[PDB]
């Protein structure tokens, strides 16, 4: 009797799970919203400098109208290799945002010290990969208490991580010079200082890794193996040749209903082989609406979670009206940021600019009154942005990359408490000039020369 | 000199052969119609109870408009595993019909007794697979003389199996309680009774398998191996890692011309990569026209074969006019049944209901006069039905599943000799009310409450 | 720590490289046009007789409108096996043209004698493959100096090989009887005559291979292994299981920009998953415009290269206006031939016939005045031709096959110095009858009975 080969089955549920971390796929938590969970772990925030600049160059005539295809290919070639390392070292990729990603090693408190060594080793191997293409890898690490919030409505779900370790990991990555691995103060306080050799960082308690200095009988493979005891989903035994246990998920309509809620419709269409793969990688003209909600205490999930859910319910209803979409949510700019996009697949519409502005104003008005929201800031920028699936075959997400994405984020940060827009949006909108105010030009982190910027004052 | 890997070649001919049994693929018989062949074997009829009910639930809002995709995924996950067992145990899957399938082990008369043991073992392993999802597997087995009929025209071919073993296998499966394996009387008469332990079945000569009771020196692998001598296409040697020898078929335009005639155009389009895969799995509104032809002796292929071919030639010409398609033909309801569908891919048309009724009347009028056809009955029902490819990658077919499919079949059986329709069809058709007669409500096997039923009396 | 499977990555650059020889993929030469390179090697020109005739038969009703699909499947089944042999024996496939291909073994002068033995062995194994389907394999071999010319503009590139060995290989193949391997005179002069047993060919210095007659201690595997020292891209070591080193190419935007210029837009669309695969294999009505440029010395690349580039620049600009495309360029008919097509994917347009004729006249007028071009001849024929991707998964190209392709080539050869057309083109064009002249019928190599032929005299 034969024992024939079992071909890998790429069921729709498996394809869906590529878009999500193990934290969600194997989380099986309540469908109630907001939902909050608390745990400890080590975070890694990896950023490829320089793709944002390459993006503009891939629109040029030398690319012969295949810029989007070339961009995604070269980006994914590099990001795939970073994803593989993270996964092989036992991490869970939580999210991609542009040319960066955030990974988590969730463990019990007693295991943080050892897992920090694992993650540093991983980081140094990732630093390794690229001595190549004007691009640099910067890595920030943090460790400690982490909260997760899941929010949404009956057909859409989103999650976010919250807390000091989350803020620290982004602060650490922002200090990295072009190839550094930076540890947060708490990470450094919890790590095995007898093996990790660091330099200090000016006016900073975070530190920079120089190298690992193992002791005499230390063997990293044996050490790693001990650490895998604490890794619930590390592929093993018959499945040790897989990059994710998620590749083995089996059809289950209840689970698939739950997971799909995290994924946008247009991506589900592709998964379901109802649209040609070529069409989700595009350089398309869009308007970014980058919404920031600041709270008194941005580390306190039980406080901020209800407020986020409240804001989300309104945000989603006005985006529906004005035809925009939430691409990503994350803690960023000392609060909760929503990266919204006007002109994604299926929503390229005339009067997009006007709509983006009216939507921004509405969200500003509403969110300003959610009582625990202290300040709302919204940046609106329009231009050609890369929209597509970034990552590895086994772990990837739809994201946006572009100078206008960065501009909208910087506007929102440098002009708090108001709705701002760039010149393209201003000049292209239907709206009368006196609905706007031309603003003082501010020198902004990583922004060459936006032309004039404006406040959208509204019909007031 | 290198000996490089030879990648599997999924030629169009191989993709076509997934849709057909070895009985056709390797049959090389005459293109003349009707064609009849006679042989012996063991039949297995496997039915998943409960998908028909799940179908209705996959239209509900909880499925977020991906019901067809979820349905097919969960169905195929389960059916694939059953197909694999059948194939590994040496069976030929003849046909899928909804959530059931029919498999054949063709052998010489002397080998029936041993092959029956093989098929029972297979059955018990399939019974095994599912202690899981409100779904149960019921299996009926028969053994003896079998006839095959091939019928059609110059561009379409169909086949069917005929005879007492064929009737017995469906009778046996209809008696199975929710997880039973039932043997037909003749199967029980031919089997190795010294190993097969059974309970009797009330008012029935068919029996129920409890277990296999092998003798002392018996080894099933060694036994199976002896049995493989009689299996012409059992994958072996270099190809022992394949589920079907058909996976090795090589391009051959003559053979492909012959095989394609069995496959619908829309499926050939997909095979030929002229349509997105996503589009053949759908929950779509259709009208089922279930045609039953009864003969004096439904086991006598040389009698009934010419009549079937005659009926087929007319059926296909009126379906062409009224825009319907034959989905399946099989012996069922004490005669030859044609499962016809209005509104398949490419044939969603306005006035579908009217057309389905006019077509039914025409077929009724014509087939009533084919002299060896004793009675014609036709049931017509309209609603949302699952249309898509069911089975395993290596062996699968386009089929329909739905409460309205079952209703049309039950109408045709419980209201013989006339054309009947359900309320949706009646209410939605163009036709005047006096073309119909409201009928007495009958309590019908596996039907909750159809609203009123009607006879289509016609313009008479 | 796991070492998980690395799935093959079919990046766009790898898919592009399937369409090109190693001569281009790994050539890294100047983007300046014309560019010329000089080297030595052995050429093999392999032709499948009989597909051109099968093409007409695949339009018949027996193929049930899947003729294009059946044709390509059976063609590629056979051509794939020939491609595999060529590649395993270390050859570079340069180009496909219809049902023929041209392969190169580039080596230093001292290695020609040994590599000729390798290529003969390959040839005899290819002769081997087909004792099968009215089809025969004819092979011509040549060896010596070869020149390469690359020509084009800022977004399109083409290459061609030039010289006596190039002319000899096509002459050798034209003398092959239905299964022969023929050596050019120079090939025979350079080969190891002590192992190669030949018959002479009447009124010819080329010879026919009967067999290899190795000496006593000769071992072909050991011999081949020595020869692989001279093969720069022979897959080896970890990659010895690959048919091409090109399957390992990694993303590189500079290289991809360069390579894509050789590939037509419609094929790039498919590579980029922006169109269903099914659509590039078609039997479509087209007009072939076969342009031949004769020079004084067709072996002298530094002479003819500037002229070809000049002609190309005009040809491409008028084809753009009249909506045609260059499918292939090669040395053929004692000069440089351009195989142009009106009605490819995306360019099916009304008044195609007229356009093809106006374009032909324009090209004739212009190219006649490029001073080193001695004579221009252009044949124009219209009919159903097979258009699609021919070859192996790892090495394939878009090409055309059809009786009208052959007719246009034969017209251009047998009616030099003028623009000619067939009856379909004449009868179907918009143009007045007196723009044409009916011509004497000539008996033409491999052409049954074109109806009348005409000169396109023009408005003169
Ligand atoms: Cl997050
Ligand atoms: Cl998000
Ligand atoms: Cl049947
Ligand atoms: Cl059927
Ligand atoms: Cl060439
Ligand atoms: Cl070419
Ligand atoms: Mg970045
Ligand atoms: Mg059923
Ligand atoms: Mg040829």
UniProtKB/Swiss-Prot annotation, chains A, B, C:
Belongs to the adenylyl cyclase class-4/guanylyl cyclase family. The gene is ADCY10. This is Adenylate cyclase type 10. It comes from the Eukaryota. It is linked to Hypercalciuria absorptive 2: A common type of hypercalciuria, a condition characterized by excessive urinary calcium excretion. Absorptive hypercalciuria is due to gastrointestinal hyperabsorption of calcium and is a frequent cause of calcium oxalate nephrolithiasis. Hydrogencarbonate binds at residues 95, 161, 170, 331. Mg(2+) 1 binds at residues 47, 99. Cleavage may occur to generate the active 48 kDa form. Mg(2+) 2 binds at residues 47-48, 99. Catalyzes the formation of the signaling molecule cAMP. May function as sensor that mediates responses to changes in cellular bicarbonate and CO(2) levels. Has a critical role in mammalian spermatogenesis by producing the cAMP which regulates cAMP-responsive nuclear factors indispensable for sperm maturation in the epididymis. Induces capacitation, the maturational process that sperm undergo prior to fertilization. Involved in ciliary beat regulation.
